[PDB]
Amino acid sequence: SINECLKAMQIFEQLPVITES
Amino acid sequence: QIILEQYDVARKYREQTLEQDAEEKIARNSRLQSEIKQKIDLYQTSIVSINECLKAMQIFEQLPVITES
Amino acid sequence: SKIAPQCQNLREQVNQLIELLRQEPTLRSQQDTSIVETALGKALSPRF
Amino acid sequence: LTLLNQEMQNLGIEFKKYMSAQINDVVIGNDREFDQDFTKLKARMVARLDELLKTFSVMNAYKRATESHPRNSTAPFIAVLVEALYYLANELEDAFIEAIHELVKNFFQRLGDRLRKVDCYHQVYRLVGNDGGIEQLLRRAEEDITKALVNEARTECDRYVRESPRFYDEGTFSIYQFRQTLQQTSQGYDAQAIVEAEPAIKELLKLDFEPKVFNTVRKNFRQTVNNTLKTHLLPMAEEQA
Amino acid sequence: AEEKYPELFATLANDLQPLCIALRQFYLENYRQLDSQPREIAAMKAQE
Amino acid sequence: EIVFAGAFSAGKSMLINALLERELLYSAEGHATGTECHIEYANANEERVVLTFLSEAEIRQQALILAKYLNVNVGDLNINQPEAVKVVSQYCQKIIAEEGGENKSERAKQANALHLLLIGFEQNRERINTVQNSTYSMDQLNFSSLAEAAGYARRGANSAVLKRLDYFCNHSLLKDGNVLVDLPGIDAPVKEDAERAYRKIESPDTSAVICVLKPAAAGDMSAEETQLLERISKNHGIRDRVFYVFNRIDDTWYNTQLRQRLEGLIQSQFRDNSRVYKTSGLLGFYGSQVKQTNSSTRFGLDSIFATTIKGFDGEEETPQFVSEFNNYCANSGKLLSTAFRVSVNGYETSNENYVRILSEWGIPLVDQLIHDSGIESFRSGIGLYL
DSSP states (O other): OHHHHHHTTOOOOOOOOOOOO | OHHHHTHHHHHHHHHHHHHHHHHHHHHHHHHHHHHHHHHHHHHHHHHHHHHHHHHTTOOOOOOOOOOOO | OOOOHHHHSHHHHHHHHHHHHHHSTGGGGGOOTHHHHHHHHHHSSOOO | OHHHHHHHHHHHHHHHHHHHHHHHHHHHTOOHHHHHHHHHHHHHHHHHHHHHHHTOOHHHHHHHHHHTOTTOSOOOSOHHHHHHHHHHHHHHHHHHHHHHHHHHHHHHHHHHHHHTTSHHHHHHHHHSSSOOSHHHHHHHHHHHHHHHHHHHHHHHHGGGGSOOGGGGOTTTOOTTHHHHHHSSSOOSTTOOGGGGGHHHHHHHHHHHHSTTTHHIIIIIIHHHHHHHHHHHHHHHHHHHO | OOSHHHHHHHHHHHHHHHHHHHHHHHHHHHHHHHHHSOOSHHHHHHHO | OEEEEOSTTSSHHHHHHHHHTSOSSOOOTTTOSSOEEEEEEOOTTTOEEEEEEOOHHHHHHHHHHHHHHHTOOOSSOOTTOHHHHHHHHHHHHHHHHHHTSTTSSHHHHHHHHHHHHHHHHHHTSTTOOSSSOOEEETTTTTOOSHHHHHHHHHSHHHHTTEEEEEEEEOOHHHHTTOOEEEOOOTTSSOHHHHHHHHHHHHOTTOOEEEEEETHHHHSSOOHHHHHHHHHHHHOTTTGGGEEEEEOOGGGGGSOHHHHHHHHHHHHHTOOOGGGEEEOOHHHHHHHHHHTTOOGGGTTTTTTTSHHHHOOTTSSOOOOHHHHHHHHIIIIIOGGGGSSOOOOOOTTSOHHHHHHHHHHHTOHHHHHHHHHHHOHHHHHHHHHHHO
16 A cells, blocks of 8 residues: 555555565 | 676566656656747747838848757 | 837837746846846837 | 576676786787887887988078068068977977877777687677677777877977077077178078078077977877876776676 | 937847847757657667 | 745845735844744634743843943943933934934944844833743733734834744645745854854755845855855755845846846856846835735825835835835836836926826736746745745
């Protein structure tokens, strides 16, 4: 949600987590 | 050396947002580019009238703008 | 004497350019329109 | 694919090593071809100086002086010295520029000819379909380097016009000898009796101009060429990598 | 009425050129500067 | 956070009033000493203000400094005694007569400044606390409206004893969360105040910096201004957030030599012209207020300038705005390319021409005057940047 909120104006993305395996 | 070997991974990682940045940036350039185009038209009309006014008596012409290309 | 239709609006035409020069923030350093102001005043309503 | 990326890095590292070695060898003078041209350049310049002053004639200097003043048809009887310095220096400068062009041109073509045999040049051309801009960058750098050297020569030869303390050596020549030719001795405005003093002034010029030339070529000119080549090439090579 | 009167307009134009000359130069530099940048998304994306 | 800086009595109070189209502050010459004011957005029904005062030690130190400059024999002058205040008042009145007026000379103004400061202290003796700066609101001091507080504050007696003001009004400019800050002049006698200004300016919390430069009128940069510019130019951390501004440009509209020097200076030093602005806050502020008047009040003479127009001898004095307005329409040449054909009659008084000119053309002339003022462009530029 934080990334989506900033997606509208700024491009500074955060670090997600996926496929820990 | 290792960090540079994963160049492809970063490209895939940020491919989700490069489209938006490029789309917005080109719009910014286009908006500003059209702004001056509007401004020069006003300048061109004004000086043309000035030259026509002086055309009746004096020959001292001004500098117009055309075919900027 | 030579009040031609072209000369009728010359008063406003010059003002148009002055505003454009003032609008440009960077070009205001070169601003020296005061000389043009005095010359235009003597052009209209001539005084000899 | 990842293995290929590693190989691309090595090509840049190898290219810089080869370019540095080639430039470094010239600095040490190990490159025999470059040395032959440089000594040839020095010999020509010294020979030009000796030949130019030995064939010097006072009348030609006087002829140049008159052209410099289109509104007059005579000379003050002293401008020959001034024109000699300008004529001597300007002619010397022209020789420097002409030879420098040849020196730079020969070096670059020899560098390019030998650069197409090493593996680094054709390993990349094997890997990709284009040269990678080596020729374009090499041509651009060569042109830029030539400009600097020409300025170096002109900015250094111009100082020769300034009279050296030896120029005012009364023993070798006294400027008041014109009184002998002028104190009721040259009744015609022909500037002919001045020719008798030609041998003396030639010695004065040799003493003044024999230095400031051997010092220049033998001491400073070599340093400028070596430093200029190294500083312009190395950053270009890094950019290419 | 025939010599001094027209001169007033003549000097006015001479005093207007110094500023009209600058406005044209400024606009062209900025306008031609933007044209250098690409327009297509594909070319722009590759640049990034 | 928006910060306005400049030398003492540089029109900073006048300039701030121009932007908001109101006289919330006072631009009296020689009186805005150390007055810091903050303005924030508030709902129409939530508008309010807060006030602050000085301490006795500072007042005595200022009185000592004022007496030190004025060389008055203040032997531990106890300003609490009406007798001593009257004696100093007679001395100040005596000095006014000798100098011919409070505003005639700088030394006269300082005598007047202490005259008003001591009187200002005498009129607000009850509200002063010995050490802590007394704090009150509109209700606590019984003030009913901001206009009452503004009128109360505008008075020289109250203004000289007010350390700080926190205004809360409803304005479109402040709606987005913009804060206006006024700082004491760096060239003030107190070195502590100057250090505070540099700390505030150098503080990263500040969002923008505004520099008011007198050389537009003086033609040369003063030592304090030179020190200020050297700090700004040599400071790479704030050089990207600077907006240079020149005030009182109207002085150069009729002076060729001053204009020529200023133009050369601008083209020589300030190459970053993208953030260089020219304006005259004095003309802009009054012009905005005049728009609220009409012919019924003689276009503000009966309502706005009724106090200034009143002369000591009974003859209607020409307000500085009116005097400049007549000069503006005559020699400035701004109207020289406008559709207007205003003419000045030498047989009519300044007020008579002022009434006649407005009665002929009216508001449209005022709009051109405000347009030529340049305040509108300045507000738009900073708003876009922020």
